[model samples]
Target: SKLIKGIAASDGVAIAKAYLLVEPDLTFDKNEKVTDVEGEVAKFNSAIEASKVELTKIRNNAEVQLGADKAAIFDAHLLVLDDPELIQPIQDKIKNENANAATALTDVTTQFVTIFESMDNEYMKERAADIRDVSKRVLSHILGVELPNPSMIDESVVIVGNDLTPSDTAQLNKEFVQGFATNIGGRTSASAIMSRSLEIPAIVGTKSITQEVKQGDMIIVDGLNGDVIVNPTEDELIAYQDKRERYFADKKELQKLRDADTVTVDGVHAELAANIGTPNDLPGVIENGAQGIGLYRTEFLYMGRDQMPTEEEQFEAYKEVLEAMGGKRVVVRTLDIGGDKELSYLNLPEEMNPFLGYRAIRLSLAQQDIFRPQLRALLRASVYGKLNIMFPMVATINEFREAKAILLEEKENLKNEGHDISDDIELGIMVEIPATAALADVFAKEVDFFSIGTNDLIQYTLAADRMSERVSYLYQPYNPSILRLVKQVIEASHKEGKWTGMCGEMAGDETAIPLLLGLGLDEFSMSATSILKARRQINGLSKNEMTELANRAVDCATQEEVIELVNNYV
Candidate 1:
């Protein structure tokens, strides 16, 4: 038996025969001359059209399987296929160099990839992989070749590959492909996101994993701990089998907690909610028994389009979610775009540091043309259910006040226009930046509630970007600094007679559950799939005991000490 450790991308266990997905050697005749210029252009256009259709089909499938956020990945691919950046270069190559369409595409796409790969930013460099994936699809169509399709597998297996692109991950067969192990990728990679959405076991960033195993070799993928065991001995197999059964049984048991209230052993009830991107996500939210929609990311409605969504269009989308929640609380976050998330049509200015630059509330206030319509839509949709508005990236009191003032202006305009608006709507700001969390007491007095966005807050506090593998260790939720800030925010809010919730990734984390519960958080919001498990974790501990655990955690000096304390208590 051979044991390998890598990044754990998803949460599950899979024991299956390995299905090696060998990479095909891509070779194009660069020296081939075009016989007909117009014919070459026609072939390129036809390949682009075919790739668009293929991507659209994948988009539709992803929407049904993984919801809108995951589905939108293909929208970027389709845009790449249609972008002047790629198409114009390919066309120019074919016309100027008298090159065949396949060769022209290969050359031009390689140029684009080279440009991206040369960037200093890791996020920008990752775009090279995306370009390569799209180029491969278009070239395949032109060359009369088929890309590897996972859906073709007839038996259950663990997919072994060098890495998975968005296109490759989209083609996964959830039934037969039980899990996947890749040589490269991280938690935020497309494969990892899709695996989580599909509830499949996945271990990525295992260098040389594809070369480590071949077809029909029994492998155990322990996604919970990022371990991949190849050709396990009988003893190892028996142990892994037992562990797999226990995992499945535990999952089934967690499902039983779905209908149960998120109450601790001491009978303190906490609101367990889901963070969603679109209306299509409600089914899973309902299935997981999410008490409410905590963070409804409104960015999806504005993304993958040529123009901003109209007020009516936005209203209908918001209303659909509001009504579907059966009058439960639905907190809609205003458009939080910028940084890695950009719109082709918006043509936002290039920034050296977009995370701190024109994004979220800042962009909304500056561009009222974009902000007013969304405010109007939220106001109109408020009549459908319990609505709460949350502003993102709010660093100062003035930013929050300006955003609130704009919202009030839109509210009055909607009322004057004969739209019935709900009067009980709550207004809040995401405490994502260190500045905002530090001034939580002041902001809590003004806003109705506070939703701590630990994903950004941790990075902002530690001065570390979680996206970078080198700094990921500093993105620790258990760090004494993070716990101290969270404690302060919760206490500040409570003192001001306001409630506090967390809508970041940490809210759903089982390890952080005890600490958060101990912090006296009123709400916990995360992905729909995590709601039941979080609820189960909450139900297992007494809030009093967790409070004691949290007290010790907050007093600890470093992340290691805090983690050790929580683990010992839990």
Candidate 2:
């Protein structure tokens, strides 16, 4: 066949026979006759016992072949599989009721999932995946079958799937895999984001990609624009090869900023920090030469889990990040969930618009019990390193006031308990909502620092749904209105003797860096890869040149004009 083309998100070029990696749904066989449930349970127990040995072998083999981190993922999975809470009852269901392996596993496992969903903690609810993974493994064993392992596949494969979870993406062996294309998900999904991070070309959201593209047909993936082209011409092949080299060359250049500081030609020093998701991601702060963590998302600690993280667990995670920063500045944003990421454990009422509903500081104040442990943890971790606490989704002064009150309550509780904690941890609020940006002066008086989260700032400002591809074109980070709001926030922050920083994608953008510098942002936090390039971009221009450009940019109304103006100068 000729070429089958699609959009590309990353620049790359390669041609190889496509290897379609579709994981079958290992659901329980629903057709079953149940008589005496107890006797049937005994038979299922025997099946589980026989399969346990083989399950361990597969888990161990994956770990041994890959690194410990990769293996540790399965280890955690095994723990969930072996949780007696999940296993014991499945055996009972099968033997007592004369149920098939699939039926028994499904019945008991779904009930266990209900229990997990009952927990109030976000971390604990994520345990449901454990039950599901183990059930699938056990059922596959009982059926005399083995689920496919994609990571272990050693050959050129263009993996096509409905969607890939984080664990699945981590398992891929990049050396042999040419690329991956998915029929579901977006740029922010773990699989799509990680694919770009891994430097492998991936095309996602190609509807019916699996049905149209067959196995062993030569295909092409343009990760730059999220494009998938099959059976390309010589010109297209050459173009892709050139694009791939440029992508790699850009990555290589960014890597060289390991030790370089982001000192501008005008001698203005701007700090570069890393945006992190978990305590496990702390190592990247130093590895990427971040001044400190710019935005340590506390939401990952809450999402996909039941049962709130204990104060101790929160403390340890926060402290590790602080110590990793080694007394540099780490601005941690407290729980920003409830939009695309939700936790059923919190009993949050479903809303028509979760983005505008109970989230971040709004949810934190409404549910103080869930919010206090995190505050206490941040306070305790503050003494070890420079820790700044930021509240997410603060749309009003009242929300910020209530969140601060909780912080005060946490401090008083720690004092009564006689735990030594820092009394002077810097407090901050994200200037993401349009209301907060408008009231920057009020916010400046109340917080120690201000950081702009451009992801939401653009969305809220333009009134555009960031996830909606149709209106996504309207989500402009560099439009005059957005820039003006940012400028207003920076000015207000400086007047209040507080520093301002940007902890959004705009911070890392090549075109926006100079404009932000001109606006006098004190800190620019970005992905590790963009630090050096941002630093390089900043080092090439002076505060005067950037300031002049920023003034000129104010006259432009559209994003394209803003980009062109910044491009010409920087």
Candidate 3:
């Protein structure tokens, strides 16, 4: 038995027999003599056939559990299995390289893995693990190894693995699993985040733990501090078991706020909404007490594939978001891609800085035909729920006019199509572009609402990409310039009877929550994990004090001062 330490993503420790899910390597022992290469090729093909059936069965169940929006992501997985970009080369390798089927499969999987890892896009890079996971599972099946079906796990156990995908995490019976330690993953890995959401202890980035942790090793996991102890002393074991109990208790307490309103001690009411990127995320929003869907990123409709998503597909997705919100205030942002997210169908010229490139409102106007259907779908779905349409990256007045014109055109078209859509659907803009933030008063007048997409606004204002580690110090959410712009937008929106909210990284930030609340932000939209924490933080502040602090925040020279001022609320 051995102990390992890793970074703690979420807190709670569990002690149980280890269920090690080993991924079998398909490569046969190179020193072994094989009779015929053609026979090996047949074996490889047979493995592929069996794996395809298994993947299909998982896809069918995933469709029901995740709905069409997420189900489509799995469809991409199936495509990869059958992708000639992957399969043909494997066949060629078996015949040409005179390799056994096992060696051929290993060579092909390794090559594709390298190709996926070389991509510049972060989102695309993350999916490489999925490719590896599925490929390994298939290889294992072909080699006649019985993989541990997590669903069959009936007792408390720590899941040991190379990596866990979202689909893998989604299937884990949360009640039975005490924790999971993975050899390959990062802090932002989906499995780690999912474990956090489920209130389970998780240690990711633990290298070589699968080989170290054997069955029946009496180990204690200190998830609060990311420590795994083997053959712990009785006192240490007892202490950790007690700590786990308290962690669960605190998590249980957070649930009490689920049905409560975000009413502050001073009685100032602000709506808290969830920032969702897909329809599959809506159930989580409802579970977390999201008053509405604050930012339904419509750009996903146009990603990953060529050819635009039909208006009906867009409508179904929009309708699902609306239905999840149950006629509450769901704000859908129009195509915000082109900057960081590229759509092959749009024919965008490659840019050195895609983040600063034509995105959001800029892309929509350049490709009106591509943009109009999304707005039309949103309008059609408005009848089913309280839908508010918002445009992203609106830098100029003309951009707003063109985007709004297309939206109105779509709305009227729906009427012509005999669909009774809501006429009262509110329209807004995300004050993310520096131009929009600087002249927010001018831009706010043209729109019914405004959302401070703090992630972009700060990045554009400071001229630093949020992901750039070297210039991260410049990525200041509380830079006076950023605060002033947020203030300008919120104040301007309220003056015109327009509502204002923030749906960005800053919205869920514990430190920024106080300052944003003081900024007179009418709503706060954040990830599911931060909902109760933000609620608890906001409900502790006095509205008048927050507003006064907001004033102090604007004059402050640095984020440090903003932090100091915010801490006074405590």
Residue-wise C-alpha lDDT for candidate 3, range 478-517, written one tens digit per residue: 7888999888888888878888899987898777887888
Model 1 Cα lDDT, one tens digit per residue, 1-570:
799899999988898999988665567677799889999899989988998898898888877666666776687678787779778988998899998998888777778788777664665676687788888888888888777767654788999988887877877888888899999988887768888878889999999788789789998999998899999999999998898899989988887887888888999989999998878788889998889999999888898788889999998999999899888999999999857665888868788788778888888887998888988889999988999999998999988888888888988887888888889999998888898888888988898999999988988999987666666788888899999999999999999889999999899888898889999999999988888888887888899988988999899989989888877764
The Cα error of candidate 1 at residue 566, in Å, is 4.0
State in Å the error of residue 170, model 3: 5.3
Question: Which candidate number has the best TM-score?
Answer: 1
Per-residue error for 525 in candidate 1, Å, reads 1.2
Off by over 4 Å in 2: 1-171, 181-185, 193-198, 205-252, 300-307, 335-359, 363-373, 396-424, 462-480, 509-518, 529-533, 536-570
RMSD of 3: 4.5
Looking at model 3, which ten-residue stretch has the lowest summed lDDT? Answer: 24-33
| Cα lDDT, model 2, residue 122 | 43
Error of 1 at 318 (Å): 2.6
- Candidate order by TM-score, decreasing, is 1, 3, 2
* Count: clashes, candidate 3: 0
Candidate achieving higher lDDT, 1 or 2? 1
Residue 3 lDDT in model 1? Answer: 90
